[PDB]
Amino acid sequence: KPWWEDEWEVPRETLKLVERLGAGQFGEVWMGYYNGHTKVAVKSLKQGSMSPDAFLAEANLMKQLQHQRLVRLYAVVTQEPIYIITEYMENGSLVDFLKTPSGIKLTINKLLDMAAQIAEGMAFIEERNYIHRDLRAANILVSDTLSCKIADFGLARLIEDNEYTAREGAKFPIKWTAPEAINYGTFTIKSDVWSFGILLTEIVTHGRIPYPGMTNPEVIQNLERGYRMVRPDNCPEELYQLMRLCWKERPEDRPTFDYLRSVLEDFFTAT
Ligand SMILES: Clc1ccccc1Nc1ncc(-c2ccccc2)n2cncc12
């Protein structure tokens, strides 16, 4: 729909940018208020840094994927500077939260709880025929009540025929990304499942880099031999075995997100 009919368009006046949370090559993220009272995140596009069609694509996808476990689109401003306004996540990114005094004190039970919440989010994404492609603790946000939500949908895609194929040039974080996606550019929900296994390591290590002490080429070498990541310090063995299922060689042997959610809730209500 055009901007004058689009239920998501808001007048820029409705928004007050209060505290900057982040700044990079392509714009900023702010905490601010919508209509004086409602706390919001505002991502702003730095003009000329990238296409506004490309920037707005993330908001259009979020219009289609609404769930409690996914950071919610609130509104767009489609005149420069372009804004995407969402649900505010008070405790910021999981990777950062896990390192704070409150993150430090969390028991394994609460960690397993948060893991289940993330799987539940991904189970919705899976049911809807989408993939995420950027699933990692940096892209999970944490609420004031310590609930978790999937964020950063920039690489997220509605799947045609189960597989998205990126361009020959395209590069992805080696430690988080499934071998078939690094090697062939082919992504499926099963690529995300692989990423989830890596994300579980970040949870149990409070946000440490996967494959401690290893370079990208070493990770690749080890994986091809049939090794997987060494058992993180203090990782319960049941969780580690659940990671290994996410890292099955054949994407099709990897579990569903519904399965992963189910098992993690069992782990949680047992601890
Ligand atoms: Cl603003 C936006 C646009 C597109 C997709 C998700 C979000 N939501 C958020 N992104 C980033 C942060 C954020 C950015 C920097 C540091 C910590 C959190 N955030 C906090 N609450 C909601 C969001």
Catalytic residue among 113, 134, 152, 192: 134
Please indicate if the annotation marks 151 as binding a ligand. no
Measured in residues, the chain has a length of 271
Among 10, 15, 43, name the best residue to mutate to test ligand 1's pocket (greatest count of ligand atoms within 8 A of Cβ): 43
Number of C-alpha atoms within 13 angstroms, CB side, residue 26? Answer: 10
d(CA 49, CA 37): 32
CATH no. for residue 38? 3.30.200.20
SS (H, E, C) the chain: CCCCCCCCECCHHHEEEEEEEEEECCEEEEEEEECCCEEEEEEEECCCCCCHHHHHHHHHHHHHCCCCCECCEEEEECCCCCEEEEECCCCCEHHHHCCCHHHHHCCHHHHHHHHHHHHHHHHHHHHCCEECCCCCHHHEEECCCCCEEECCCCCCEECCCCCEECCCCCCCCCCCCCHHHHHHCEECHHHHHHHHHHHHHHHHCCCCCCCCCCCHHHHHHHHHCCCCCCCCCCCCHHHHHHHHHHCCCCHHHCCCHHHHHHHHHHHHCCC
Nearest CA to ligand 1 atom 11: 29
**What is the CATH number for 204?**
1.10.510.10
Q: Is 134 a catalytic residue?
A: yes
**Domain housing 15:** 1-88
Chain discontinuities in the chain, listed by preceding residue (C to N exceeding 2.5 Å): none
Q: Are residues 20 and 103 in the same domain?
A: no
Tokens of 148: 């978790």
Residue among 193, 192, 206 nearest 263 (CA): 193
For this PDB entry, the determination method is X-ray
Residue 223, annotated as binding a ligand: no
Q: Cα 142 to the chain's mean position, in Å?
A: 11
Tokens describing residue 238 = 């049941």
Specify burial of residue 88 (Cβ count, 10 A radius: 0-12, 13-18, 19+). Answer: buried
Both tokens of 200, joined, read 């579980």
Residues 154, 28: one domain?
Answer: no
What contacts 160, CB < 8 A, 6 or more positions away?
A: none
Spacing, Cα 71 to ligand 1 middle (Å): 8
Same domain, 55 and 79: yes
Last residue of a domain, one of 88, 112, 127: 88
Q: Are residues 161 and 271 in the same domain?
A: yes
Least Cα distance to 263 among 189, 180, 188, 196 occurs for 196
Query: CB atoms < 10 A from the CB of 218, how many?
Result: 11
The answer to whether 203 touches 137, Cβ cutoff 8 Å, is yes
Q: Are residues 235 and 173 in the same domain?
A: yes
Buried b (16+ CB within 10 A) or exposed e, 153-166: bebbbeeeeebbeb
From CA 176, how far away is CA 196, in angstroms rounded?
Answer: 8
240 and 229, same structural domain? Answer: yes
Q: Which residues 6+ apart lie within 8 Å of 79 measured at CB?
A: 12
Structure tokens at 46: 């730095």
Final resolution, Å: 2.1
- Residues 36, 99, single domain; the answer is no
Check whether the bond before 81 is cis (ω within 30° of 0): yes
Cα(87)–Cα(89) distance, integer angstroms: 7
242 is in an annotated binding site: no
Measuring from each residue's beta carbon to the nearest atom of ligand 1, which residues come in under 6 Å? 21-22, 29, 41, 43, 58, 71, 84, 86, 88-89, 92-93, 141, 151-153
Task: Give distance in angstroms: CA of 253 to centre of ligand 1.
Answer: 33
Are 75 and 117 found together in one domain?
no
**Residue 42 annotated as part of some ligand binding site:** no
- For residues 260 and 242, give the distance between their C-alpha atoms in angstroms, rounded to a whole number: 8
Distance 112 CA to ligand 1 centre (A): 23
